[PDB]
């Protein structure tokens, strides 16, 4: 995409801590949330769930004709419901303005005006605080890393002159088709409006890359998940390479399921939740350690703190069936997927060693708040598939009838998440 010139871009300031030093940085909104308009007029190129066919009769013409504009200081709050102070960021769910309603948001951490911060997680400990108390069933306040390009794609894709400054270049291990710009071009060819999301659709291409989920959660359930792909960084896909949901799920370039560590799914139902060992009614500290040895990454450990108290990760609780693993390791991934009867695409795509190489190349930090128009967040917090009760189907305490976006957007529009005190540094000991 080209950048529009109606509104100077403002990145929302955010402080964090890197290797013992305070860093005065900022966040940027993902290009998918921006005003996309004619290069010569205020006419929208994209509105609602469809492109304007006069501006966008084909992808190349759309790319020539359309531009993504800036988000000014006031618009963060008034349109997207996003605020920051010090090292604290709050994202909102439903925000209604004079003219429009926004649902959720996705932001990236910047290094400077034109480049994302690049995290090299190997042999490091990454921590933050989160308040998930205002996230019901069907919501996800997420913090994660993806193998996006540092510059958002400007060096790779000459038609992307907007770049990381405008939040371009999102990819993840879902190979999403809902991206409006992929590979520097409008993804307008083959566009189909969503069945149930008035603001979204899908185009022919998807945007794939490795993904390390630190925190996918609401007040009822939480997980952390490693997803490896067989492709090198940001990779557009078409056709079966995208591994689309349904029949193609295991045929593409990325591992959609990932190797997940989700305490409730692992038989530890009282560990996290309202009044749990880790009480989701109160802010908590989430600590993640990327342990390496001669084989590269070999373990992803989790520690919590709450109220000053260290709380070790809850171990797998299927006595006699699965060993009491308490972290992501290769053996865990293999054994748990056998017990759950899940296809091990994680290993097919390179396993822990592939994941290690992905982390070595660096990742971009993402924070988001969303509902799930495909699967109602049931994979996170309910039973999924809804018609199974085999081990691994149960994910959390929420109903199989929960999480429809038309329910949650109407019944809990005021949902929010707050992330704070983001930090990276050497691996610490917790006794
Ligand atoms: O929908 C986004 C979510 O997908 C999961 S994979 C998920 C599948 O939806 C389900 O078919 C499979 O059987 O269970 C898993 C849940 O672990 C992905 O892991 C996650 O990181 C992503 O945000
Ligand atoms: Ca210490």
**Angstrom resolution of this structure:** 1.1
Residue 356 tokens, joined: 């290690």
Is 258 near ligand 1, meaning CB less than 6 Å away?
A: yes
3-state secondary structure of 424: strand
**What residues form the annotated binding site for substrate?**
80, 102-103, 180, 213-216, 227, 249, 257, 379, 395
Is 376 near ligand 1, meaning CB less than 6 Å away?
A: no
Architecture per CATH, 2-431? Distorted Sandwich (2.70)
With CA atoms as reference, report the closest residue to 41 among 6, 79, 3, 10.
Answer: 6
Residue 44 tokens, joined: 């929208």
Q: Report strand pairing: 125-131 vs 284-293.
A: antiparallel
Burial class (CB in 10 A: 0-12, 13-18, 19+), 319: exposed
Active site residue ranges: 211, 216
Sign of CA dihedral 17, 429, 360, 257: negative
Is 379 near ligand 1, meaning CB less than 6 Å away?
A: yes
Atom of ligand 1 nearest to the CA of 211: 21
Total residues belonging to the chain: 431
Q: Is 314 in contact with 268 (CB distance < 8 Å)?
A: yes
Residue 226 tokens, joined: 């490693």
CB atoms within 10 A of CB 317: 14
Residue 232 tokens, joined: 């090198």
Mutate which of 226, 229, 258 for ligand 1? The one with the most ligand atoms within 8 Å of its CB, which is 258
Q: Is 424 in contact with 18 (CB distance < 8 Å)?
A: yes
Element (H, E) at 138: none
Q: Residue 175: which region, alpha, beta or left (left: phi > 0; alpha: psi -120 to 50)?
A: left
Element (H, E) at 337: helix 330-340
Which ligand has its closest atom nearest to the C-alpha of 423?
2
Residue 142 tokens, joined: 């997420």
Q: Is 424 in contact with 286 (CB distance < 8 Å)?
A: no
Residue 46 CB contacts under 8 Å (≥ 6 apart), including other chains: 36, 52, 56, 66, 180
The full set of domain ranges for the chain reads 2-431
Is 345 near ligand 1, meaning CB less than 6 Å away?
A: no
* Angstrom distance (rounded) from CA 16 to CA 171: 24
DSSP string, 342-397: ---HHHHTTHHHHHHHHHHH-BEEEEEEEE-TTTTTHHHHSBSSTT--STTSB-SS
Q: 124 CA to middle of ligand 1, Å? A: 26
Residue spans of beta strands (DSSP E) within 294-344: 296-306, 309-312
Residue 383 tokens, joined: 């039973």
Q: Is 58 in contact with 384 (CB distance < 8 Å)?
A: no
Atom of ligand 1 nearest to the CA of 142: 23
Indicate the angle between helix axes 330-340 and 351-361, nearest 10 degrees: 130
* Angstrom distance (rounded) from CA 105 to CA 124: 28
Atom of ligand 1 nearest to the CA of 380: 16
CA 120, distance to chain mean position in Å, is 18
Which approach determined this entry?
X-ray
Is 213 near ligand 1, meaning CB less than 6 Å away?
A: yes
């Amino acid at each position: 995409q080209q950048a529009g010139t109606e509104t100077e871009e403002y990145h929302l300031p955010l402080t964090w801590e890197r290797d013992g030093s305070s860093v005065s940085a900022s966040v940027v909104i993902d290009s998918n949330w921006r005003w996309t308009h004619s290069t010569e007029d205020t006419t929208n190129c994209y509105d609602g769930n469809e492109w304007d066919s006069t501006l966008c009769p084909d992808a190349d013409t759309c790319t020539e004709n359309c531009a993504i504009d800036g988000v000014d200081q006031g618009t963060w709050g008034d349109t997207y419901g996003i605020t920051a102070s010090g090292s604290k960021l709050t994202l909102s769910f439903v925000t209604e303005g004079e003219y429009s309603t926004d649902i959720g948001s996705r932001v990236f951490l910047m290094a400077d005006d034109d480049n994302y911060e690049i995290f090299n997680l190997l042999d490091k400990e990454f921590s933050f605080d989160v308040d998930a108390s205002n996230l019901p069933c069907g919501l996800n306040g997420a913090l994660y890393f993806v193998s996006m390009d540092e510059d958002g794609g400007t060096s790779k894709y000459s038609t992307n002159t907007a770049g990381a400054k405008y939040g371009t270049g999102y990819c993840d291990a879902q190979c999403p088709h809902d991206m409006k710009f992929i590979a520097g071009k409008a993804n307008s060819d083959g566009w189909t409006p969503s069945d149930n999301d008035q603001n979204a659709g899908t185009g022919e291409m998807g945007a794939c890359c490795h993904e390390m989920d630190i925190w996918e959660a609401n007040s009822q359930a939480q997980s952390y998940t490693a997803h490896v792909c067989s492709v090198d960084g940001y990779t557009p896909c078409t056709g079966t390479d995208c591994g689309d949901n349904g029949d193609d799920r295991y045929k593409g370039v990325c591992d959609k399921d990932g190797c997940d560590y989700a305490a409730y799914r692992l038989g530890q139902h009282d560990f996290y939740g309202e009044g749990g060992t880790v009480d989701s009614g109160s802010t908590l500290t989430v600590i993640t350690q990327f342990i390496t040895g001669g084989g590269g990454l070999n373990e992803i450990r989790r520690i919590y703190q709450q109220g000053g108290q260290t709380i070790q990760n809850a171990a797998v609780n299927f006595p006699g069936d699965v060993d009491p693993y308490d972290s992501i390791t290769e053996d865990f991934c293999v054994d748990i997927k056998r017990y759950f009867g899940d296809t091990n695409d994680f290993d097919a795509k390179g396993g822990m060693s592939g994941m290690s190489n992905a982390l070595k190349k660096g990742m971009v930090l993402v924070m988001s708040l969303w509902d799930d128009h495909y699967a109602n967040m049931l994979w996170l917090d309910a039973t999924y598939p809804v018609d199974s009760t085999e081990p691994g189907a149960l994910r959390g305490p929420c109903s199989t009838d929960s999480g429809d976006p038309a329910d949650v957007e109407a019944n809990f529009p005021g949902s929010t998440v707050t992330f704070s005190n983001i930090k990276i540094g050497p691996i610490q000991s917790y006794d």
